[PDB]
Amino acid sequence: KSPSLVRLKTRGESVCPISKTVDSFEVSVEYIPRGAVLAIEEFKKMVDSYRGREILHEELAVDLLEKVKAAVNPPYVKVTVKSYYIGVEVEVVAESGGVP
Amino acid sequence: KSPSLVRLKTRGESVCPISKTVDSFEVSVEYIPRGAVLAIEEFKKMVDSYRGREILHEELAVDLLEKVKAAVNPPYVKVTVKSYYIGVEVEVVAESGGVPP
Amino acid sequence: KSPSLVRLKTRGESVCPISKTVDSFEVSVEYIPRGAVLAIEEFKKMVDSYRGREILHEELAVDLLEKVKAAVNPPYVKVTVKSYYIGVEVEVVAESGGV
Amino acid sequence: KSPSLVRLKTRGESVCPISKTVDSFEVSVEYIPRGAVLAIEEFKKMVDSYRGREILHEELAVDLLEKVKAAVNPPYVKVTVKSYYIGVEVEVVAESGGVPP
Amino acid sequence: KSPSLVRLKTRGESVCPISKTVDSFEVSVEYIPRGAVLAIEEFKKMVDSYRGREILHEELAVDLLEKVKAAVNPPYVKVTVKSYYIGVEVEVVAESGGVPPVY
Amino acid sequence: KSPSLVRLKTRGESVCPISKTVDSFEVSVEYIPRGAVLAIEEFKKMVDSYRGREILHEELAVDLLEKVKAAVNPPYVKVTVKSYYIGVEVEVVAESGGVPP
Amino acid sequence: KSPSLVRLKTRGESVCPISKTVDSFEVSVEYIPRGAVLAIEEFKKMVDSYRGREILHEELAVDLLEKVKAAVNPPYVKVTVKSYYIGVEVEVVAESGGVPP
Amino acid sequence: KSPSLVRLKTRGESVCPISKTVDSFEVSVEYIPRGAVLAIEEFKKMVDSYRGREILHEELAVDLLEKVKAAVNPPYVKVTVKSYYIGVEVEVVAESGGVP
Amino acid sequence: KSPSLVRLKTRGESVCPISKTVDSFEVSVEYIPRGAVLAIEEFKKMVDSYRGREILHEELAVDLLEKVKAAVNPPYVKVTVKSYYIGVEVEVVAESGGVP
Amino acid sequence: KSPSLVRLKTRGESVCPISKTVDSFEVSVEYIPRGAVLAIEEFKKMVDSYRGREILHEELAVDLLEKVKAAVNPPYVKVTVKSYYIGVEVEVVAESGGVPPV
């Protein structure tokens, strides 16, 4: 019997395409396992893969959502990325398997 | 796929019509993207547009809502304006489209 | 175009009808405007009208909801009064409708 | 007219039947009045009645629920007792009814 | 007549199989009694049983669920194990049953 | 025997002399008693005395300090008025000393 | 040897001599042991002695300081009582001996 | 008889001279009035003067301290600027006068 | 060079001699190293040594102070035990090498 | 004129030489400038330098102190490293200099 839910939360970094400087973030994933739990090692790998990558955080959220789906194919996955830029607090959510 | 939700939060200022003096506020916008995400620089410009402008926090929330719809036309947007006035904590909310939670 | 929801929160005072002592509270009002937003100055007046009034907080929440309904007639109001009495934290909520 | 909802929260104590030792707790009650508001005085008596009584918090919660139901017969009541024992944070909830019946 | 819901929360530890080091956790259990309440003392022994045991937290949450179901056969139980590994905050949940819909 | 220190904190209001609107504040008072503790009722009256009065919070802090001194003559008093004006958090402190036994 | 410092904190109640109603408080005790530590049971008895007693919190703080001094004679003790009365937060401090640096 | 200490806190903005992008900050000032209390309007104008100015936050703090000294000459002033850049929380303090 | 200061904090438990029951606590140690830094594993072992031991939290603090002194001999050590007992929050401090 | 004090705080990571596993940390540096301010970009690279490095957090604090002193020789520096390991909250402080007393 697998867990019914896993939540993962960690910090990461990427390169902001506009400024071209390092943009730190906090990322959260929540998923319902379907016969496979994502190794913590592998998740960190996915998050650290964005270091030095020019990518906007909106596309980071969706990209990581796609990675988790390709790795363990859960019926429900939510990814939230939180960061700060030019005095604004920003959160972007990507979600697959929620309401239609 | 687009993100399913974006939340933005920042501080701004306007001129209060009743007191005739500068009033601080905190503003949050939550929206369901459809196509492009609102650039943060653009959001900051919208909020900054109210500096020096005499406008009630009720009307500012509604105005900002219409500015976000004009720019990125999301199916759902909610704007919340929080401020402190004469010892009263005030939140004003302006919302267009269907409930997300 | 009215906003779709307003939240107001502030401190006030009443008089405890048993001891005749000042009884401090925090009050939160939440309403859906229908074409009229209650002016903050008017809200403060309503809350301040309870100074010197002997009234239990259970009745004040109901009384205040009535003042708001009569002033701006919203379709949904909720009034929450919080206070602390004989070592009990009390919240009293008075409503009218869904959300 | 009655309030639509009341919440009450206070501290109390009982005696742990294992060690015969004082067993402090926090208790919260929420209920929907139906024609009758429980006096705060009377709630505090109900809570203080457990002082020096040997009773498990699992039983106290249910006992207090019954007491509130007997005093004001609300359509909904929920009693929560929170305490600390052998390094374990415990909450016991006892709940009755709902809206509608 | 028993409670409607009990929530228990405490700290524990196991041994991480990959690094052979102590893997500290917080565990939360919530359940609906059906004519048996889980004694707190029995709960704390279940949780302490993992001290020195090599077991992934994903397995631990499920194992502890199975322990609680076996002790009191409740119609609903949820176990949540929170730990911190390689800079990642982890929460693993195991569930069984629930309240059928308040019709 | 009297306490070594008392701290009091409450909310009040005054009138901003420029705008003539309500200027809400939080006020904290610390004092070392000299044989005599200020009644709370009397402190509340002092604070409530600024209601409707046009005065700057600078001045208020000092005025209240003087009222406390005139009433129970402590060898040490400190008054702190905190308010929020044109998006600036402001704290004004006034303090006064003397000799003990 | 003894500890260098103990701090204790708990809630109590007394009866307000003006309103005659139960008057809740928080009390902290800090002291430097000299050869003996106050048993927690003993402390809780002291704090519970005020239940049902008409006493001002300012008098209570000093009274509890004396009880502590009588029980275990520490070279430094400080007692702080915090309560809420007519919209004012009150802290009363009673202190005895040379103060920590 | 005037105040023994004033504490002011607010938000502002400057322009980062490397990135040329908006560099948002919180500023705290405390000072001992001697004679003169700084008008809040006037303090606010000091802080707002940095908006659209290319100035590093270490310079700004010092610049603002001199402004408060030039306006009201207190025997003690302390200015703290807090900001966030590339994932680092930064506080710059510029302090003058005071007995020990 | 050694660090100038170390703080450790963790949870543990003992057995209350009054009630006979397990008594949980939080413990903090602060020391100035002189040569030796206490291995965290070793600290954990000292705090875990109190499990199933009948001891008052007052004595516990002093006992752990003497263990740390015995292990790494710092010129300054402070131990603080915090617990909750019969509705009373309790903090006990033991200190070695401050002003006497 | 230089600032009187600068505080920097960020998150980093290293590898525990005992367990061989990544440990996350928060690090704060506080210093008094003497006519050189450490550019932020430089501080960030000092902290990033520990990623994958097998080093005890005790040694990290002292090693980072020494990097700040070498780079800008301030008359006071304090480095604090905070982390969590086997259920223990740890803070290591490395400190050099100060304000010379009157």
Curated annotation (Swiss-Prot), chains A, H, I:
Keywords: Transferase, tRNA processing. The keyword tRNA processing applies. It comes from the Archaea. Substrate binds at D23, L38, A39, I40, E41, H57, E58. It catalyses: 7-cyano-7-carbaguanosine(15) in tRNA + NH4(+) = archaeosine(15) in tRNA. InterPro entries: GTP-CH-I_C/QueF (IPR043133), NADPH_dep_7-cyano-7-deazaG_red (IPR050084), QueF (IPR029500). Its EC number is 2.6.1.-. One of its GO terms (molecular function) is transferase activity. Pathway: tRNA modification; archaeosine-tRNA biosynthesis. GO terms for biological process: queuosine biosynthetic process; tRNA processing. The active site is at C16 (thioimide intermediate), D23 (proton donor/acceptor). It holds the Pfam family QueF. Forms a symmetric tunnel-fold (T-fold) homodecamer of two head-to-head facing pentameric subunits, with 10 active sites at the intermonomer interfaces. Belongs to the archaeosine synthase type 2 family. Is responsible for the final step in the biosynthesis of archaeosine, a modified nucleoside present in the dihydrouridine loop (D-loop) of archaeal tRNA. Catalyzes the conversion of 7-cyano-7-deazaguanine (preQ0)-modified tRNA to archaeosine-tRNA, transforming a nitrile group to a formamidine group. Can use neither glutamine nor asparagine as amino donor in vitro, is only able to utilize free ammonium. However, the enzyme might function in vivo with a partner that serves to generate ammonium. This is Archaeosine synthase.
From Swiss-Prot, chain C:
Is responsible for the final step in the biosynthesis of archaeosine, a modified nucleoside present in the dihydrouridine loop (D-loop) of archaeal tRNA. Catalyzes the conversion of 7-cyano-7-deazaguanine (preQ0)-modified tRNA to archaeosine-tRNA, transforming a nitrile group to a formamidine group. Can use neither glutamine nor asparagine as amino donor in vitro, is only able to utilize free ammonium. However, the enzyme might function in vivo with a partner that serves to generate ammonium. The keyword tRNA processing applies. Forms a symmetric tunnel-fold (T-fold) homodecamer of two head-to-head facing pentameric subunits, with 10 active sites at the intermonomer interfaces. SUPFAM superfamilies: Tetrahydrobiopterin biosynthesis enzymes-like. It holds the Pfam family QueF. The gene is queF-L. Substrate binds at D23, L38, A39, I40, E41, H57, E58. GO terms for biological process: queuosine biosynthetic process; tRNA processing. Disulfide bonds: none annotated. Its EC number is 2.6.1.-. Belongs to the archaeosine synthase type 2 family. The lineage of its organism: Archaea, Thermoproteota, Thermoprotei, Thermoproteales, Thermoproteaceae. It is an enzyme of class 2 (transferase). Keywords: Transferase, tRNA processing. The active site is at C16 (thioimide intermediate), D23 (proton donor/acceptor). This is Archaeosine synthase. GO terms for molecular function: preQ1 synthase activity; transferase activity. Pathway: tRNA modification; archaeosine-tRNA biosynthesis. Gene3D superfamilies: 3.30.1130.10. It catalyses: 7-cyano-7-carbaguanosine(15) in tRNA + NH4(+) = archaeosine(15) in tRNA.
